[PDB]
Symmetry: C2
Subunit: 101 residues, 2 copies
């Protein structure tokens, strides 16, 4: 597999992490702060003017950082993935009258 | 944001789940079995001829299913995401001489 919709799907989220987590191959982790810039630089639709300080702020905080001292592989998928569920489809635009704290 | 590399990245993994987890909007979950077909139908590069029964088999089993009785949002990102780390970049093609059980 290569040109498969899913194929491009996987490589997509893995790299969002790798990009900040290493441009020339360094380690299998990243940085809580390095994630900051990425979100605001390549994910404004999720944190546009911080219209919602409960999507990103809640994820990055609850991500529980303690893996090798640095970020991680799923931590990112978890970091951004969670936002997708708290900003993109899956959960949002599905239960407008069923949303609360 | 819309045409951003990350933008397409998020929508990519969310839909892999949604697609099996509902084509016309049903719920925010999926099905352990429904995931089976998806992997073999749109992710053979990860389970091609089951060359590696430790990537998918270990993920789907350890995913710990007990959310609303059905699958879930991250469960998929976790299911496929984990594979990306156990088959795609992030972890693989990074430590050839540093891999083991």
């Amino acid at each position: 597999s290569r040109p498969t919709e899913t194929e491009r799907c996987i490589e997509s989220l893995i790299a969002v992490f790798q990009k900040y987590a290493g441009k020339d191959g360094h380690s299998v982790t990243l940085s809580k702060t390095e994630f900051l810039s990425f979100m605001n630089t390549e994910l404004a639709a999720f944190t546009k003017n911080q219209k919602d300080p409960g999507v990103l702020d809640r994820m990055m905080k609850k991500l529980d950082l303690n893996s090798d001292g640095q970020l991680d592989f799923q931590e990112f998928l978890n970091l951004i993935g969670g936002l997708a569920v708290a900003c993109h489809e899956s959960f949002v635009k599905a239960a407008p009258p069923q949303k609360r704290f």
